[PDB]
Scaffold this active site. Structure first.
Site, PDB file in Angstrom:
ATOM      1  N   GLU A   1    -108.928 -66.221  -1.713  1.00 60.08           N
ATOM      2  CA  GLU A   1    -108.555 -65.323  -2.803  1.00 60.08           C
ATOM      3  C   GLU A   1    -108.823 -65.894  -4.194  1.00 60.08           C
ATOM      4  O   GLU A   1    -107.894 -66.308  -4.877  1.00 60.08           O
ATOM      5  CB  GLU A   1    -107.098 -64.905  -2.661  1.00 60.08           C
ATOM      6  CG  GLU A   1    -106.754 -64.428  -1.266  1.00 60.08           C
ATOM      7  CD  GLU A   1    -105.424 -63.712  -1.196  1.00 60.08           C
ATOM      8  OE1 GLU A   1    -104.413 -64.258  -1.695  1.00 60.08           O
ATOM      9  OE2 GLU A   1    -105.391 -62.598  -0.629  1.00 60.08           O
TER      10      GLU A   1
ATOM     11  N   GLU B   1    -107.640 -61.314   6.715  1.00 58.78           N
ATOM     12  CA  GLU B   1    -106.187 -61.226   6.528  1.00 58.78           C
ATOM     13  C   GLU B   1    -105.753 -59.759   6.647  1.00 58.78           C
ATOM     14  O   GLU B   1    -105.322 -59.141   5.670  1.00 58.78           O
ATOM     15  CB  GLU B   1    -105.759 -61.824   5.180  1.00 58.78           C
ATOM     16  CG  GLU B   1    -105.492 -63.322   5.209  1.00 58.78           C
ATOM     17  CD  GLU B   1    -105.074 -63.888   3.861  1.00 58.78           C
ATOM     18  OE1 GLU B   1    -104.579 -63.120   3.005  1.00 58.78           O
ATOM     19  OE2 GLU B   1    -105.233 -65.110   3.656  1.00 58.78           O
TER      20      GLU B   1
HETATM   21  O1  IDF Z   1     -99.104 -62.437   3.386  1.00 58.15           O
HETATM   22  C1  IDF Z   1     -98.968 -63.540   3.002  1.00 58.15           C
HETATM   23  O2  IDF Z   1     -97.878 -64.283   3.052  1.00 58.15           O
HETATM   24  C2  IDF Z   1    -100.084 -64.337   2.353  1.00 58.15           C
HETATM   25  F1  IDF Z   1     -99.528 -65.155   1.357  1.00 58.15           F
HETATM   26  O3  IDF Z   1    -101.035 -63.448   1.789  1.00 58.15           O
HETATM   27  C3  IDF Z   1    -102.077 -64.039   1.013  1.00 58.15           C
HETATM   28  F2  IDF Z   1    -101.661 -64.180  -0.325  1.00 58.15           F
HETATM   29  C4  IDF Z   1    -102.484 -65.432   1.553  1.00 58.15           C
HETATM   30  O4  IDF Z   1    -103.832 -65.794   1.146  1.00 58.15           O
HETATM   31  C5  IDF Z   1    -102.174 -65.674   3.006  1.00 58.15           C
HETATM   32  O5  IDF Z   1    -102.285 -67.099   3.269  1.00 58.15           O
HETATM   33  C6  IDF Z   1    -100.787 -65.198   3.458  1.00 58.15           C
HETATM   34  O6  IDF Z   1    -101.004 -64.399   4.663  1.00 58.15           O
END
Ligand code: IDF
Ligand SMILES: *[C@@H]1O[C@H](CO)[C@@H](O[C@@H]2O[C@H](CO)[C@@H](O[C@@H]3O[C@H](CO[C@H]4O[C@H](CO)[C@@H](O)[C@H](O)[C@@H]4O)[C@@H](O)[C@H](O[C@H]4O[C@H](CO)[C@@H](O)[C@H](O)[C@@H]4O)[C@@H]3O)[C@H](O)[C@H]2NC(C)=O)[C@H](O)[C@H]1NC(C)=O
Ligand SMILES: *[C@@H]1O[C@H](CO)[C@@H](O[C@@H]2O[C@H](CO)[C@@H](O)[C@H](O)[C@H]2NC(C)=O)[C@H](O)[C@H]1NC(C)=O
Ligand code: NAG
EC number: 3.2.1.76
Length: 595
Positions: free
Chosen positions: A140, A257
C-alpha cells in the site's frame, strides 16, 4: 420452498483455476515457535490448498557495503519446509540503511540489493522454484507506511525501476507486480495511478527506454462486511485500467487482500466460526461464477488472497482474522503455545478438493434462477485422469451464507440433483459437512466455559470439533445419478465428493515431521505431493516403542496433534494414506521422537 442445485457432470465447461491459494500477514517474531506452528498448519492444508504467504517487512530481516541475510534465510527456509512460497514484497529499509529513493546513490544500492537476494535464493532453492514467486512492491504505497524511508511520487518510480532491473539482473524469468493498493478515484491513489502511467509510458530510471515491465497489477479491495461488494469494486477498477491503459488489458489482476472487513485485530464473533468460513467460500464462488466463467468482458483475474495468516492475541483467541486460534498456556513449566485449526482453515481444505474443470451448475428456488450473489450457491468440478494413480472426480461444494450474519434459528432445505456421471469402476460418493453446531472449536471452547489456559483434555475436546462430519463412502446410484436432500444450517458448507476407483493404490506419504508442543504432547505434520490422488478417507498413523495404530476419527488434513492419555510420546512414528476403497498406500519413512 427448497433450493434446487443441479450439476451436469457431462457438461465440463471452461477450465477452473485454483486462484485463491494464498494468505498473508504483517509482523509487529517470524522465527519464533508460535510462527513455526502457524505455518505448519497453513502448509498442512491438503493438496497444496494454500501456496503463498504474502509477508510484509521482509527486507527488515536483512541487516547492514554488504548484507547479513541470516534472518531472511530463516523465514524463507521455514516457508520452504512447509511447501510454501513467499509473497515477496520488496518492502523494508535493510535495517535503516535506505532512507530516500530520490537519492540517486540509494536507487543504485537498491537495485544491487534486489539482485543480491534474488541470485542468493536462486542459488538456494533453484530458479525453477524462485520463478514461481510473486515479487511485489512495498505494500500500500498510498497509505504512507514507509517509516523513516522517504517515498515521493518520483521516489516510488525509481524504487520500482530498481526493483524491476534488479530482479532482471538475477533472471528475466522473475515475476514482479504491484502496486498493491486500493485504486480510488483520482486525485486519490496518486502513487498507484502514477506507477501504471510510468510502466505504460514512462522511461526506465536505468535503461532510458520507454515503458517498464509489469507482470501483474495487484490491488486491495475489502468488503465492508458485504461479499459481493468485493467483486463489484474490482470490476470498477479493472475496467478503469483496461480503458486508461490499453497495454495492460491482458495484464493479470490480483486482489491480495480480499477480506470481508478491514482490521484483522478487531474482534468479530463471525470471524470465529463457520460464518467466516462459508463467507470466504461464497466470495470465491462469486469470483469464479460471475467473473471468470466466460462473461462478456472477462477481466484477467488470477489471484485472490485472504490476509489471515496473523496470530491471534489474548483476550481474543478465535474472534480475530486468523486461520488458527492461538493459546499461550502460561502456567506450565515452561509456558508453551498451542494452535487450533479454525473453521476457515478447514474450509480451505474443502476448496482444495476442487479440480481443473468447472462443471455446469444451477441454483434455482421454486422457479427463479439465483447467481452466487445470493445466500446459497455452488462450485462444481471434474477431473480428467492423469496417471494410473488417479481416476475421475467430481467436487461439488455448496455454501449457505448470509455473509457476516449467522442465523441459528433458521434451516435451509436443499435438494442436490447430480446428473451425467461418466461410467467407471467403483463409483462412490462422500459427504463432508461444516456448521456452527457440529464443527466449531470456538463453540466447544465456550461450552467448556472459556478456559484461558486450556488443559490437555480441554484441547482434545476443542480439536474434536475441527474436522467436518464425514459419511462412509456409499456407492453411487445406477445410471450416473445422485439426489440428496440435506438440511443445511446458516452458515454451512457441504462438499459431495464422487470418485471412481483408480487402478493403483495411493502414493507414499513424505516429509513427516515431529514438532514438540509441551510435555507429553506433539504435532505430527506431513506432505501429500506423492500421494497422487484426492480420494482419501484418512491418514493411518502408527506409533512404536520397539508399531500399533493411533486410533483417531477420520481426517485428511495434513496435521495431527498427538495427545495420548498415557503421556507416552517418545518413540517412532509413520503415516500412510487410506482411500475410499479401504486401500492402504505405502508408509512414510519412520520419524523418531525423544522427549
Ligand atoms: O485489514 C487489516 O487489518 C489490514 F491492516 O489492512 C491493510 F491496511 C494491511 O495492508 C493489511 O496488512 C491488513 O490486512
Ligand atoms: C501469556 O503470556 C504472553 C506473553 O508471554 C502474553 O501475551 C501478550 O498478550 C498481550 C495482550 O493480552 C499482547 O499485548 C497486546 O498487543 C496488541 C498488539 O500489539 C502490537 O500492535 C499494536 C498496535 O498495532 C502496537 O501498538 C504494539 O506495540 C504491538 O506491536 C495490542 O493491540 C494490545 O493493546 C490493546 O489493549 C490494551 C489493553 O490490554 C490497551 O491498553 C491498548 O490501548 C490496546 O487497545 C496489547 O498491547 C502482547 O503482545 C502479548 N505479548 C507477547 C510477547 O506475545 C499473554 O498476555 C499471557 N496470557 C494471559 C492469559 O495473560
Ligand atoms: C447483487 O445483488 C444485489 C441485490 O441483492 C444488487 O444490488 C442492487 O443493485 C441495483 C442496481 O442494478 C440497485 O438498483 C438496487 O438498489 C440494489 N439492491 C439492493 C437490495 O441493494 C447488486 O447490484 C448485485 N450485484 C451483482 C454484481 O450481481
Ligand atoms: C548475522 O546475524 C546473526 C544474528 O542475527 C549472527 O549470529 C551472524 O553472525 C551474522 N552473520 C554474519 C555473516 O555476519
Amino acid at each position: 420452498a427448497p433450493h434446487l442445485v443441479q450439476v451436469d457432470a457431462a457438461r465440463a465447461l471452461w477450465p477452473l483455476r485454483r486462484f485463491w491459494r494464498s494468505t498473508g500477514f504483517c509482523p509487529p517474531y517470524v522465527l519464533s515457535w508460535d510462527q513455526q506452528l502457524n505455518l505448519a498448519y497453513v502448509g498442512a492444508v491438503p493438496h497444496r490448498g494454500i501456496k503463498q504467504v504474502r509477508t510484509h517487512w521482509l527486507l527488515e530481516l536483512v541487516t547492514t557495503l554488504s548484507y547479513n541475510f541470516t534472518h531472511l534465510d530463516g523465514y524463507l527456509d521455514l516457508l520452504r519446509e512447509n511447501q510454501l512460497l513467499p509473497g515477496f514484497e520488496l518492502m523494508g529499509s535493510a535495517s535503516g540503511h535506505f532512507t530516500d529513493f530520490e537519492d540517486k546513490q540509494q536507487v543504485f544500492e537498491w537495485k544491487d540489493l534486489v539482485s543480491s537476494l534474488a541470485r542468493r535464493y536462486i542459488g538456494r532453492y533453484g530458479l525453477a522454484h524462485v520463478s514461481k514467486w510473486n515479487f511485489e512492491t512495498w505494500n500500500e504505497p498510498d497509505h504512507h507506511d514507509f517509516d523513516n524511508v522517504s517515498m515521493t511520487m518520483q521516489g516510488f518510480l525509481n524504487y520500482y525501476d530498481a526493483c524491476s532491473e534488479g530482479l532482471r539482473a538475477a533472471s528475466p524469468a522473475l515475476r514482479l507486480g504491484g502496486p498493491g493498493d486500493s485504486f480510488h478515484t483520482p486525485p486519490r491513489s496518486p502513487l498507484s495511478w502514477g506507477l501504471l502511467r510510468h510502466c505504460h509510458d514512462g522511461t526506465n530510471f536505468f535503461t532510458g527506454e520507454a515503458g517498464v515491465r509489469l507482470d501483474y497489477i495487484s490491488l486491495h479491495r475489502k468488503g465492508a462486511r458485504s461479499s459481493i461488494s468485493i467483486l463489484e469494486q474490482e470490476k470498477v477498477v479493472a475496467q478503469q485500467i483496461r480503458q486508461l491503459f490499453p497495454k495492460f488489458a491482458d495484464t493479470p489482476i490480483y486482489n491480495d487482500e480480499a477480506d470481508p472487513l478491514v482490521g484483522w485485530s478487531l474482534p468479530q464473533p463471525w470471524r470465529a466460526d463457520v460464518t467466516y468460513a462459508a463467507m470466504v467460500v461464497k466470495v470465491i464462488a462469486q469470483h469464479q461464477n460471475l467473473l471468470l466463467a466466460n462473461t462478456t468482458s472477462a477481466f484477467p483475474y488470477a489471484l485472490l488472497s485472504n490476509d489471515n495468516a496473523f496470530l491471534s492475541y489474548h483476550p481474543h483467541p478465535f474472534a480475530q482474522r486468523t486461520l488458527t486460534a492461538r493459546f499461550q498456556v502460561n502456567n506450565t513449566r515452561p509456558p508453551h503455545v498451542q494452535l487450533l485449526r479454525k473453521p476457515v482453515l478447514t474450509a480451505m481444505g474443502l476448496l482444495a478438493l476442487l479440480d481443473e474443470e468447472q462443471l455446469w451448475a444451477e441454483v434455482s428456488q421454486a422457479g427463479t434462477v439465483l447467481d452466487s450473489n445470493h445466500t446459497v450457491g455452488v462450485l462444481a468440478s471434474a477431473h480428467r485422469p492423469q496417471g494410473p494413480a488417479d481416476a475421475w472426480r467430481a467436487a461439488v461444494l455448496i455454501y449457505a451464507s448470509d455473509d457476516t450474519r449467522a442465523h441459528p434459528n433458521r434451516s435451509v432445505a436443499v435438494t442436490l440433483r447430480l446428473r451425467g456421471v461418466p461410467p467407471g469402476p467403483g463409483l462412490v460418493y462422500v459427504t463432508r459437512y461444516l456448521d456452527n453446531g457440529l464443527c466449531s472449536p470456538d463453540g466447544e471452547w465456550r461450552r467448556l466455559g472459556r478456559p484461558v489456559f486450556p488443559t490437555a483434555e480441554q484441547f482434545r475436546r476443542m480439536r474434536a470439533a475441527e474436522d467436518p462430519v464425514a459419511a462412509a463412502p456409499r456407492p453411487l446410484p445406477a445410471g450416473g445419478r445422485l439426489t440428496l436432500r440435506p438440511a443445511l444450517r446458516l452458515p454451512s458448507l457441504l462438499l459431495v465428493h464422487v470418485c471412481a476407483r483408480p487402478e493403483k493404490p495411493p502414493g507414499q506419504v513424505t516429509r513427516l515431521r515431529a514438532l514438540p508442543l509441551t510435555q507429553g504432547q506433539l504435532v505430527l505434520v506431513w506432505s501429500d505431493e506423492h500421494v497422487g490422488s484426492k480420494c482419501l478417507w484418512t491418514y493411518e498413523i502408527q506409533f512404536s516403542q520397539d508399531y500399533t495404530p493411533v486410533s483417531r476419527k477420520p481426517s485428511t488434513f495434513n496435521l495431527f496433534v498427538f495427545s495420548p492419555d498415557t503421556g507416552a510420546v517418545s518413540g517412532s512414528y509413520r503415516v500412510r494414506a487410506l482411500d475410499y476403497w479401504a486401500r492402504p498406500g505405502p508408509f512414510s519413512d519412520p520419524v523418531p521422537y525423544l522427549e
